[PDB]
């Protein structure tokens, strides 16, 4: 039921993507970043693996 009321997917996804704009990212990590965003977009936000993916993406974009 909660899925029909709120969704924070787009905000965090765009927050990740905006960091990519200024960076000349190599392909061998561009594909990894893209696939991790894809995985995060289909994963429940309360799972531990979701937080692991989020932290890994934050470190990648840092």
């Amino acid at each position: 039921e909660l899925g029909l009321e709120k969704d924070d997917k787009d905000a965090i996804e765009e927050k990740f993507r905006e960091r990519l704009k200024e960076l000349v990212v190599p392909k061998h990590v561009m594909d990894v970043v893209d696939e991790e965003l894809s995985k995060l977009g289909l994963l429940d936000n309360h799972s531990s693996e979701f937080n692991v993916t989020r932290n890994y993406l934050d470190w990648l974009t840092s």
Binding site: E1, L2, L4, E5
Partner: peptide, 10 residues
Amino acid sequence: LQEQLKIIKK
């Protein structure tokens, strides 16, 4: 909107 009547109950 209408689903809130059951969401709040849950």
